[PDB]
Design a protein around this ligand. Structure first.
Ligand SMILES: [Ca+2]
Ligand SMILES: [Ca+2]
Ligand SMILES: [Ca+2]
Ligand SMILES: [Ca+2]
Ligand SMILES: [Ca+2]
Ligand SMILES: [Ca+2]
Ligand SMILES: [Ca+2]
Ligand SMILES: [Ca+2]
Lengths: 184, 184
């Protein structure tokens, strides 16, 4: 009935679902392929901000602990700290639950040089490619997420499956994470 | 202190602010450069969904009026209609107030062939280019939005100011709307 409205919803779903897939792969790499030595500084920062020690950073902890993320802040700077905190939550809170867990914190804060090492990209790919055939398929994706509808599937791989063959090979997986991590 | 976290916040701001600028230009074109004859079908649909006649579509009106956006729906289909409505609101509710006003509805639903005509692109550009020098500047942007900080300014024009000269010329304005409207 309204093609521009149907295209608008589909474009947004394609963007949302392709970002969700790239975020899940990056979060796997950051939380499961990293060592304690390589995230020591992040851990000390996270532990200092996590006052109640519950393993998550709430909005109030992020406000009070802002100085550890940066340098001292002024007493009258609360409106801007609050604004800064909302941007941190916007950039790092992947599951939108209003908390930054350890995995989300390492994903956004870790040095890309160590997070994006070739060996981590290879191990991440090999975790998704369950049958080891060199391509990530629908069923392998469904299993990884603990579940897939054809339309939901096509939108996750939108702008990732560059050659459009319904699978994600190592070069397309590598480019997916690059697109997600790029400062351009 | 944490360069990947500072880059993550900046990348998100660049994306958010560049989308906000492109959306404001498209909404100007859809609501101010269009005729009643060219939006007649959209108007009849909007008026049919707007039951209380208040000029806006709330979430309940969108649910009840789903059939006008598409074809009859099944009695047990409410969970999916609700899901479909949330995607419409996600794609069309620009000011995030929880309502689709007439301007937002025309912006997402109008045929791109008539919305993206050369004359509408020229008139939209000429509205932003106040001094008529062939480029849209900071001050012209600030005036248009009814207000600009240097950082906020650089992020709005990020991925729009292709040649990086601090201004938006007609070719970069044309490409900005294309990027926003593209199904790729
Ligand atoms: Ca905590
Ligand atoms: Ca979270
Ligand atoms: Ca496989
Ligand atoms: Ca492929
Ligand atoms: Ca209404
Ligand atoms: Ca709205
Ligand atoms: Ca000008
Ligand atoms: Ca320019």
């Amino acid at each position: 009935e309204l093609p521009s409205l149907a295209n608008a919803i589909e474009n947004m779903r394609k963007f949302q679902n392709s970002q969700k897939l790239a975020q899940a792969a990056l979060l796997y790499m950051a939380s499961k392929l990293t060592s304690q030595e390589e995230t020591k500084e992040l851990t000390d920062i996270f532990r200092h901000i996590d006052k109640n020690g519950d393993g998550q950073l709430d909005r109030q902890e992020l406000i009070d602990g802002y100085s550890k993320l940066s340098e001292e802040v002024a007493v009258f700077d609360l409106p801007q700290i609050e604004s800064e905190v909302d941007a941190i939550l916007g950039a790092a809170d992947f599951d939108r639950n209003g908390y930054i867990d350890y995995s989300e914190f390492v994903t956004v804060a870790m040095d890309r040089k160590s997070l994006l090492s070739k060996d981590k990209l290879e191990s991440a790919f090999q975790k998704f490619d369950q049958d080891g055939n060199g391509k990530i398929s629908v069923d392998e994706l469904a299993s990884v997420f603990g579940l897939l509808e054809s339309k939901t599937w096509k939108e996750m791989i939108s702008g990732i499956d560059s050659n459009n063959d319904g699978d994600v090979d190592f070069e397309e997986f590598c480019k997916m994470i690059q697109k997600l991590c790029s400062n351009n």
